[PDB]
Structure formats: structure tokens, C-alpha cells
Amino acid sequence: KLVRLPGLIDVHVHLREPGGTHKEDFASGTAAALAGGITMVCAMPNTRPPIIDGPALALAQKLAEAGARCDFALFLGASSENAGTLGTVAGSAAGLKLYLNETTSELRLDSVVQWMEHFETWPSHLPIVAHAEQQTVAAVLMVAQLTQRSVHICHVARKEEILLIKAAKARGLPVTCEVAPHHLFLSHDDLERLGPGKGEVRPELGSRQDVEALWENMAVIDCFASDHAPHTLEEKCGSRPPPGFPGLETMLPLLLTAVSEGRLSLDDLLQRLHHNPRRIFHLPPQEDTYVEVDLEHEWTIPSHMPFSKAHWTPFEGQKVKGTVRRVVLRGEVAYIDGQVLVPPGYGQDVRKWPQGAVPQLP
Ligand SMILES: O=C1C[C@@H](C(=O)O)NC(=O)N1
Ligand SMILES: [Zn+2]
Ligand SMILES: [Zn+2]
Ligand SMILES: [Zn+2]
Ligand SMILES: [Zn+2]
Numbered sequence: 214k215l216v217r218l219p220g221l222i223d224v225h226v227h228l229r230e231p232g233g234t235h236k237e238d239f240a241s242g243t244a245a246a247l248a249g250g251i252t253m254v255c256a257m258p259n260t261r262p263p264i265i266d267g268p269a270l271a272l273a274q275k276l277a278e279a280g281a282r283c284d285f286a287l288f289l290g291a292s293s294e295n296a297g298t299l300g301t302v303a304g305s306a307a308g309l310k311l312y313l314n315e316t317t318s319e320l321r322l323d324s325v326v327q328w329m330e331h332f333e334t335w336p337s338h339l340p341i342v343a344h345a346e347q348q349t350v351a352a353v354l355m356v357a358q359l360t361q362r363s364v365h366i367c368h369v370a371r372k373e374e375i376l377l378i379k380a381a382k383a384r385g386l387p388v389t390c391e392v393a394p395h396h397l398f399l400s401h402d403d404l405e406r407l408g409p410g411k412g413e414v415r416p417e418l419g420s421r422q423d424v425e426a427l428w429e430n431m432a433v434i435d436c437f438a439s440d441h442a443p444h445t446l447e448e449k450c451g452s453r454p455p456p457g458f459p460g461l462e463t464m465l466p467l468l469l470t471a472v473s474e475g476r477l478s479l480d481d482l483l484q485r486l487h488h489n490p491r492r493i494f495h496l497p498p499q500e501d502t503y504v505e506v507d508l509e510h511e512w513t514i515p516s517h518m519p520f521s522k523a524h525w526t527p528f529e530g531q532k533v534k535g536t537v538r539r540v541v542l543r544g545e546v547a548y549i550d551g552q553v554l555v556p557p558g559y560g561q562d563v564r565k566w567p568q569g570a571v572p573q574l575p
Contacts, residue, residue, distance in 0.1 A: 310342050338572070369390045410449050459521040467531070
């Protein structure tokens with residue numbers, strides 16, 4: 214007997230197109246999404262070229278429309294040059310992404326004043342999300358308060374961070390956050406097995422106490438999001454390993470296992486992979502869209518999942534219970550038992566749907 218879930222939403226994926234298509238492209242990354250029970254993704258802007266200007270966004274939109282198999286929205290990225298220039302295209306994006314820790318030269322902000330300028334110029338009704346670790350959480354929260362608006366914190370990974378956000382919520386501040394599965398299901402205890410290259414990720418893997426704190430503070434976590442960050446094994450195992458894990462194909466099975474064990478409820482999962490993504494990012498419903506899962510099937514994660522071009526996974530060897538059997542997307546069968554059945558280009562930019570515009574005052 215299968216359980217019918219709504220179309221799940223992953224608000225944090227790296228699909229690598231343009232410019233990194235040996236790691237993933239829209240077609241392979243959205244195949245991975247569908248096989249993970251995800252019907253809508255929000256793609257990050259740290260591509261090559263990065264999505265930091267209108268021409269780059271226009272290119273990425275066409276590449277996504279041609280390659281995506283599930284629906285999507287595309288983030289814009291903040292740069293040291295683009296504050297006050299994105300007003301005409303801002304509403305067509307998922308939101309604005311700020312990379313506030315170590316990043317590329319194109320996305321690097323060298324001063325908190327540049328963060329302020331983005332918060333002051335980006336349209337006030339549109340989402341802002343930040344890669345903000347440790348004290349950077351507190352710093353970006355201060356900028357948000359100075360500019361009188363909300364912020365969403367990506368991939369919270371530490372006891373320190375979740376407790377800070379908890380304290381901010383207790384003071385009524387408009388902050389939301391997401392957590393990635395590797396910060397719930399892996400820790401320092403796994404670094405020996407992974408090795409130093411595969412184990413590289415930002416935020417880094419936490420201690421057992423960090424992991425425990427995230428679970429104990431589940432009420433503070435608004436969303437789950439994979440931070441699907443595919444790189445090839447050659448890259449992960451080479452001399453300058455890039456940080457990141459693929460995660461679209463493993464996120465839902467890992468979380469269903471936890472539901473099975475009573476660590477969180479099915480509702481808790483659906484708030485965090487459906488309702489709260491919708492409401493924080495003002496993402497539209499997908500008509501005639503659902504995911505059927507088998508909660509009884511026990512399996513072991515293999516050395517690579519079928520679809521991501523990363524062709525490796527840090528969750529190899531973990532025992533999970535729960536699997537995606539079928540996905541229907543806008544009335545068409547998109548996935549059954551390991552076969553993706555919608556072509557590249559089936560997916561659409563949800564920000565172009567009438568119901569997908571973010572409401573604003575005239
Ligand atoms: O901040 C980031 C970016 C990401 C990537 O590979 O794009 N991978 C990571 O581990 N953290
Ligand atoms: Zn990040
Ligand atoms: Zn995020
Ligand atoms: Zn990311
Ligand atoms: Zn519901």
C-alpha cells in the first residue's frame with residue numbers, strides 16, 4: 214500500500230548548467246529530483262557564468278526550459294557590482310542569494326556594507342536567502358533588522374546556529390531556515406569512512422552534538438533542502454576537492470526512514486518539503502502533481518545513485534526504509550521505479566505562471 218504525497222519542493226539545488234555540465238545539467242539534475250520525489254527545484258546562481266546579471270539569467274532560463282524535466286525557479290546571485298541593478302528581473306527569479314562566507318571572486322562581498330546595499334535595493338517583497346555560517350548568521354540577521362525585512366538562512370548545520378535562530382524567533386524576528394540531510398544523517402563520525410576529499414562540504418559536517426541539536430530543535434527548522442552540490446568523484450578525490458554532496462536522490466529516502474523510526478512525523482516532513490517552501494518563496498501549486506512512496510521497502514544506499522552525474526554519494530552503505538515508486542507531474546507520469554518518463558524540457562519556470570508571481574503592492 215502506497216502513500217500519496219504532494220509534489221515536494223527543494224529550495225536549494227546546484228544544477229551546474231551553464232558551465233559545469235560534466236558535474237550535472239538541468240536534464241540529469243531534474244531526473245535526480247524526480248527520482249527523489251521532488252517535483253520543483255530552486256537552482257542556485259553559482260554557475261559558469263554566474264547568474265548575477267540579466268543576460269546570464271536569460272541564458273539560464275532558456276537552458277532550464279530546454280533541459281529541465283521538473284518545474285523550477287532560478288535564483289539570482291548578489292555580487293559586489295549588481296546591487297540596484299536587478300530591479301527589472303528580480304520578480305522573475307526564485308529570490309536573491311547571498312554567499313557570505315568563502316566563495317568565488319564573482320559572488321564575493323567584501324564588506325557588510327555591500328550586504329546592506331543588497332537588502333536596501335532588492336525589492337522588499339522578494340526572498341533573500343544567505344549562505345551564512347556561525348557568526349555570519351547573527352551578522353546577516355543584524356543587517357535584516359537594520360533594513361526592516363526578512364531573511365532565510367540556508368543549510369543550518371550547527372547547534373550554535375540553530376540556537377541563535379531559535380533565540381531570534383523567540384524575539385519575533387522574521388527569519389526562517391532550512392537544514393540539509395547530510396547535517397541530520399552524517400557527522401564527524403563519518404569522516405574516517407568518507408575520507409578528507411569526499412567529506413569536504415560547506416557547511417562542514419558537524420559533531421554528534423550538532424546533529425543531536427538539529428533534531429532536538431526540529432520545531433525551529435522551517436524547510437529541508439538538499440544543497441545538492443554535485444561534483445565528480447575525480448574532483449572530490451583529487452588535489453583540490455570542491456566542497457559539496459549530491460543529495461536529490463537520497464534526501465527523501467533518508468527522511469522517510471526517520472519518519473518510520475518516529476523521529477519526526479509525516480506531517481513534519483510535509484511542512485518542511487512542501488508547505489513551508491511554498492509559503493516562504495511564494496511558489497505556486499502544481500496541478501495534478503503527486504508522489505507515491507512505499508514506506509516498507511528496506512534497501513541500502515549504493516555507491517552511486519542512478520541519475521546524478523556526480524556518480525557518487527556520501528550516504529553509501531546507510532540502510533534506509535522508504536522509496537519513491539511513482540511521480541506524476543502536471544498530469545503526466547514522470548517517474549516509475551527507476552525510469553524517468555518525461556523528456557528534457559517538460560519542466561517549466563514557475564515564476565512565469567500567473568499564480569507564481571510574488572504578490573506586491575502596486
Ligand atoms: O556553499 C557551498 C556551495 C556548494 C557548491 O558546490 O556549489 N557546495 C558546498 O558544499 N557549499
Ligand atoms: Zn551554501
Ligand atoms: Zn538555501
Ligand atoms: Zn548551495
Ligand atoms: Zn498538506
